[PDB]
Amino acid sequence: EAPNQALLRILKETEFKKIKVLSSGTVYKGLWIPEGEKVKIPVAIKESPKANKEILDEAYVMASVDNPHVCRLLGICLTSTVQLIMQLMPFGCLLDYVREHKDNIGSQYLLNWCVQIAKGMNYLEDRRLVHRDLAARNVLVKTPQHVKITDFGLAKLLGAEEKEYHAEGGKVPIKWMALESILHRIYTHQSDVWSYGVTVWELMTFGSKPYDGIPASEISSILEKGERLPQPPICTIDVYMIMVKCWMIDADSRPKFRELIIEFSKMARDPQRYLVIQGDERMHLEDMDDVVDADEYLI
Amino acid sequence: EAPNQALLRILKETEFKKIKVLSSGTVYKGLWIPEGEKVKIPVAIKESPKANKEILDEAYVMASVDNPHVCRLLGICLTSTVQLIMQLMPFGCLLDYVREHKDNIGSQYLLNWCVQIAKGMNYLEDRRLVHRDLAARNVLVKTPQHVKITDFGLAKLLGAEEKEYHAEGGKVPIKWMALESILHRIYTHQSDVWSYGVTVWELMTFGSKPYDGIPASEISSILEKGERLPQPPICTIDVYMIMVKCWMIDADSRPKFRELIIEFSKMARDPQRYLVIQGDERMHLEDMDDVVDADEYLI
Numbered sequence: 306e307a308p309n310q311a312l313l314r315i316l317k318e319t320e321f322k323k324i325k326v327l328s329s330g331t332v333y334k335g336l337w338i339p340e341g342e343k344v345k346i347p348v349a350i351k352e353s354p355k356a357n358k359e360i361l362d363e364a365y366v367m368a369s370v371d372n373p374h375v376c377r378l379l380g381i382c383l384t385s386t387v388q389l390i391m392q393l394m395p396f397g398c399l400l401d402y403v404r405e406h407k408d409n410i411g412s413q414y415l416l417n418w419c420v421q422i423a424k425g426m427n428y429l430e431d432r433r434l435v436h437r438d439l440a441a442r443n444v445l446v447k448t449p450q451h452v453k454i455t456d457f458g459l460a461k462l463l464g465a466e467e468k469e470y471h472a473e474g475g476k477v478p479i480k481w482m483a484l485e486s487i488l489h490r491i492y493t494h495q496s497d498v499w500s501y502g503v504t505v506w507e508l509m510t511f512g513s514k515p516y517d518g519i520p521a522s523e524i525s526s527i528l529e530k531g532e533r534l535p536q537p538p539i540c541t542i543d544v545y546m547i548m549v550k551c552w553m554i555d556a557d558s559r560p561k562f563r564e565l566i567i568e569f570s571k572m573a574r575d576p577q578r579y580l581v582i583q584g585d586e587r588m589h590l591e592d593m594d595d596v597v598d599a600d601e602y603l604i
Numbered sequence: 605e606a607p608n609q610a611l612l613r614i615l616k617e618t619e620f621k622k623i624k625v626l627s628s629g630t631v632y633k634g635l636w637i638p639e640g641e642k643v644k645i646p647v648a649i650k651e652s653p654k655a656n657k658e659i660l661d662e663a664y665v666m667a668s669v670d671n672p673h674v675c676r677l678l679g680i681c682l683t684s685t686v687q688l689i690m691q692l693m694p695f696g697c698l699l700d701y702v703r704e705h706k707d708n709i710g711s712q713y714l715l716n717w718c719v720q721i722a723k724g725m726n727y728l729e730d731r732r733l734v735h736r737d738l739a740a741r742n743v744l745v746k747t748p749q750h751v752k753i754t755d756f757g758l759a760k761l762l763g764a765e766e767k768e769y770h771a772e773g774g775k776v777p778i779k780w781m782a783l784e785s786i787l788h789r790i791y792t793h794q795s796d797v798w799s800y801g802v803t804v805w806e807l808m809t810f811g812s813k814p815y816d817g818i819p820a821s822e823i824s825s826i827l828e829k830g831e832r833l834p835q836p837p838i839c840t841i842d843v844y845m846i847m848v849k850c851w852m853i854d855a856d857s858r859p860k861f862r863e864l865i866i867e868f869s870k871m872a873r874d875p876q877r878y879l880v881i882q883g884d885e886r887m888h889l890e891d892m893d894d895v896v897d898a899d900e901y902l903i
C-alpha cells in the first residue's frame with residue numbers, strides 16, 4: 306500500500322546525558338539537549354549481529370508510529386553499541402504500577418486505561434500493524450492519566466493483502482495468546498484483541514498472573530476445553546462479558562478495538578456502575594526551566 | 605442505577621455429557637457434573653458473528669436474573685461453537701403442555717400458572733427488565749406445579765431514567781404485542797402486561813392461536829377499531845375482565861403485574877368459582893443417587 310515516510314532521527318552522543326540506571330541490557334533515565342535548541346527532554350536510553358538486527362527492526366517500527374497512546378521514539382545513536390532514545394515514562398510499566406498502588410486505584414482510572422489502550426491498539430490496526438505482545442508489562446505510564454503501548458519487539462507491519470502473519474519459531478508469551486496463535490502461529494489484529502482481554506484482566510485483578518501456577522503447555526487444551534480466566538472480584542458482569550467476548554475461539558466473533566473504545570467509554574462515563582472497588586470515591590493519584598516533554602517536542 | 609454483580613460461570617466441556625437431542629440450532633438434554641462435587645445436574649445445552657453476539661447478550665440477561673419463576677442459566681462454554689447450559693425443564697414449554705394435556709388440566713393449575721408467571725414478570729419489572737417476548741411458547745415447565753419464564757432473546761435491561769425502549773427494526777411477534785409497540789415500537793413493562801393478557805388467553809383456550817388465520821398487518825387496525833380476543837369458553841367474566849384490562853389502549857390503565865398476582869391468587873384460592881371446566885375435581889398431573897436439581901445447586 307502507501308510509502309512509509311517516517312523520519313528516522315540519528316542523535317549525536319554528546320547531545321544526551323545519562324542520569325541514573327533504570328534496568329539491567331541497561332536502560333538509563335537521562336536528558337536529551339538537542340542542537341542548540343534551548344530545550345531539555347527527559348528520555349529513556351537503551352544501550353549479537355542478531356541483537357543489533359533486532360533492535361533496529363524495533364526502531365524501524367517505533368519510528369513508523371505516531372499516536373498519543375503508543376510509545377514515542379526520539380531517535381537512535383549509532384555509537385559502537387547502538388542506543389535507542391525514547392520518551393521517559395516516569396511511572397514505569399502499568400503492571401508494576403497497579404501492583405504497587407492497588408489501594409489507591411479507582412474505577413475511573415482502570416476504565417480510562419482500558420479506553421486508552423484500545424485507542425492505541427485501534428491506531429496500530431489502522432497502520433496494519435499486529436503487535437503480538439500486548440500485556441500490561443508492555444504498557445508505560447507517562448502519568449496516571451496517560452498510558453502508552455510499548456514493546457514492539459515481536460511486532461509485524463503487514464505488507465500487501467497479507468491478512469495474517471504466520472510466525473516462525475521463537476519464545477512467545479503463551480498466557481496472552483489467542484488460541485489460533487498458540488496452535489498454528491497465526492497472528493491478526495483479532496489475536497491482539499485476545500491479548501487485550503488478558504491485559505484488561507491483569508488490570509482488573511490489580512496485577513495478578515494469568516493462570517498462575519499452570520504450565521504453558523497445558524494452556525492449549527484448557528482453552529479448547531472452553532475454560533477461561535475467572536471473573537475478577539471488582540468486575541460487574543458488563544465488564545467481564547467484554548473480556549470473555551475477547552476470548553471467543555471464533556476470531557471474527559471477538560470485538561474490534563474500535564468497539565472496545567466505545568464500550569469502555571460508555572462505562573468510563575459512570576465508573577462505579579461497572580467496577581465495584583472498596584473506597585473508590587476517596588482515591589487520588591535542578592536546572593529545569595527548559596524542560597519539555599517529548600509530546601511537546603515536534604520536529 | 606446499581607452495579608450488576610451477577611457472576612457469569614464458564615464451564616469446561618468435559619464437565620458435561622449430552623444425552624439426547626431435544627431440538628434442531630440443536631439443544632441437548634444432558635448432565636452437568638461439576639468439579640469433583642459429587643453432584644449431577646440435569647441440564648439443557650444449546651449449541652454468525654451476529655449469532656454469537658446474540659447468544660452472549662442473552663447469557664448476559666439470564667445471568668443477571670435470579671427468581672424461582674425465571675429460567676436458570678448455569679453457565680456458558682466457550683468451545684469453538686458457544687454452548688449455553690440451563691436448567692433442564694423436563695415437561696418442555698407450556699404451550700405444548702396445555703396442547704398435549706388439555707383433558708387433564710384443572711382450574712387450579714391454570715390459575716397457579718397465571719400467578720407464577722405474574723410473579724416472574726413482576727420480578728423482571730423490579731429489575732427494570734422489559735421482556736418483549738412473553739408468550740406461552742416462552743414458558744417452561746419444570747413440573748406441572750412449577751413454571752418459569754424463558755427466552756430472553758428480545759429482552760432489554762433499561763438503563764438510567766430510560767422509561768421505555770424504542771426498538772430498531774427486526775422480526776417481532778405481532779399477535780402478542782401492545783398496540784404502542786406495533787405502531788411506534790415502544791416497549792414498557794406495561795406492554796409486557798398486554799402480552800401477559802394474550803398468554804393467559806392462550807392458556808385459557810388450551811393452546812389455541814391468537815387471531816388464528818388473520819395476517820399480522822391487519823392486527824393494528826382491528827385493535828384500534830376496538831376489537832379483542834374473544835372470551836374463552838371456560839372463563840368466567842371475572843377472569844376475562846382481567847384479560848381485557850390488559851388490553852386497554854391506555855398503557856397506564858392496564859393492571860400492574862403486582863396487581864395481577866393479587867387478582868389471580870384470590871381466584872386460585874377458589875378455582876371452580878372462576879374457571880368452569882368439565883371434569884375438574886377428577887384431574888391429576890440410571891446412576892442417579894447424586895442427581896440434584898439446579899434449584900438446589902447454589903454456588
Ligand SMILES: COc1cc2ncnc(Nc3ccc(F)c(Cl)c3)c2cc1OCCCN1CCOCC1
Pocket residue numbers: 327328332348349350351389390391392393394395396397398401445
Ligand atoms: C521510570 O521507570 C521507567 C521508565 C521508562 N521510561 C521509558 N522507557 C522505559 N523503558 C525502555 C524500554 C525499552 C527501550 F528501548 C527504552 Cl529506550 C526504554 C522506561 C523504563 C522504566 O523502568 C524500568 C523498570 C523498573 N523496574 C525494573 C527492575 O525492578 C522493577 C522495576
Ligand SMILES: COc1cc2ncnc(Nc3ccc(F)c(Cl)c3)c2cc1OCCCN1CCOCC1
Pocket residue numbers: 626627631647648649650688689690691692693694695696697700744
Ligand atoms: C424436555 O423438553 C425440553 C426441555 C428443556 N429444558 C430446558 N431448556 C430447554 N430449551 C432451551 C432453550 C434455549 C436454551 F439456550 C437452552 Cl440451553 C435450552 C428445553 C427444551 C425442551 O424441548 C424442546 C421442545 C421439544 N419440541 C420441539 C420439536 O417438537 C415439539 C416439541
